């Protein structure tokens, strides 16, 4: 489904082809700092650049997945994760991505990329993934 | 004033480093077709992609110059050229480029890049130049 020019842009962004599509994770610490779901202003600006880079090569569909580590209440973490993905979705909408083409999901603790017994692994698990499907 | 990352985006657009900065020309026949200053819808989308490409690498300041060939009245061609640059500016604003960072100029027939004796040359002169000062 994606053209070579689109793949080249995604690779330049640091995205990697996974079973859900081309995926780029960003730290929650970087995106939100001490906030809950309000983005830090520099992070909003970074996200707008990503959205505009995608839109400039007609990538106009994305899936945004929020994730946490396993510390804390499961239901809270799921709600938090969904609201954090939604904050990223709001930036993509404001940049010009059609709202109907944005899928937003909060996975809470259910899909780790790292081991939850380390600070560093818990850290890597607190993230919002930007996913461009490859179909 | 521009990083390599920014220069690379400009090169990909076809920009060359000229007098006023990094410049590429978009054909008026492509942008406007048979219209006066109304952009063709496909051409609006093309310009939005260009604006977003520049914005994605923090190029948020441009100069837009309208140009005509030597066919018709000097003053009308100047006015036409200014309105055509302004239509492009409106697309750039809608894409998110700050309005205060966009300079719009109509140069009319005054700064040709090709010989106006030829249909091909006249067309090369009917253009909107997109310039990123360095």
UniProtKB/Swiss-Prot annotation, chain B:
Q: What is the effect of changing residue 10 to P?
A: Is predominantly a monomer. Shows a much higher peptidoglycan-binding affinity. Forms a stable complex with YfiR
Biological process terms in GO annotation:
bacterial-type flagellum-dependent cell motility
Record's superkingdom? Bacteria
Q: Relay the activity regulation note.
A: Both lipid anchor in the outer membrane and peptidoglycan binding are required for full activity. Once activated by certain cell stress, the dimeric YfiB transforms from a compact conformation to a stretched conformation, allowing the periplasmic domain of the membrane-anchored YfiB to penetrate the cell wall and sequester the YfiR dimer. GMP enhances the binding affinity between YfiB and YfiR.
Annotated membrane topology is: Lipid-anchor
Can you name a GO cellular component term? cell outer membrane
Its localization reads: Cell outer membrane
Keywords (A to Z) from UniProt: Cell outer membrane, Lipoprotein, Membrane, Palmitate, Signal
Q: Where are the transmembrane segments?
A: none
On subunit structure and binding partners, the annotation says:
Homodimer. Interacts with YfiR. The YfiB-YfiR complex is a 2:2 heterotetramer.
- State the protein's purpose: Activates the diguanylate cyclase TpbB/YfiN by sequestering YfiR at the outer membrane, which counteracts the YfiR-mediated repression of TpbB/YfiN at the inner membrane and leads to increased c-di-GMP production. May act as a sensor of envelope stress. Part of the YfiB-TpbB-YfiR (or yfiBNR) system, encoding a tripartite signaling module that modulates intracellular c-di-GMP levels. The system is a key regulator of the small colony variant (SCV) phenotype, and plays an important role in biofilm formation and in vivo persistence. The c-di-GMP produced by TpbB/YfiN stimulates the production of the Pel and Psl exopolysaccharides, which promotes surface attachment, generates an SCV phenotype and confers resistance against phagocytosis.
The domain comment in this protein's record states: Dimerizes via its N-terminal region.
State what protein this is by name. Outer-membrane lipoprotein YfiB
> Can you name the source organism?
Pseudomonas aeruginosa (strain ATCC 15692 / DSM 22644 / CIP 104116 / JCM 14847 / LMG 12228 / 1C / PRS 101 / PAO1)
Which part of the entire sequence is included in the shown chain?
A: 34 to 167 of 168
């Amino acid at each position: 489904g994606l053209s070579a020019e689109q793949i080249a842009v995604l690779q330049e962004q640091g995205s990697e082809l996974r079973d859900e599509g081309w995926e780029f994770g960003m730290s929650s610490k970087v995106l939100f700092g001490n906030n809950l779901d309000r983005l830090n202003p520099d992070s909003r600006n970074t996200l707008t650049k990503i959205a505009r880079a995608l839109l400039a090569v007609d990538i106009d569909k994305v899936r945004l997945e929020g994730h946490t580590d396993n510390y804390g209440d499961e239901g809270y973490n799921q709600k938090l994760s969904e609201r954090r993905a939604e904050s990223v979705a709001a930036v993509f909408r404001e940049a010009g991505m059609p709202a109907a083409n944005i899928e937003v999901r909060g996975l809470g603790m259910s899909k780790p990329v790292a081991d939850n017994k380390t600070r560093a692994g818990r850290s890597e698990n607190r993230r919002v993934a930007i996913i461009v499907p490859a179909e």
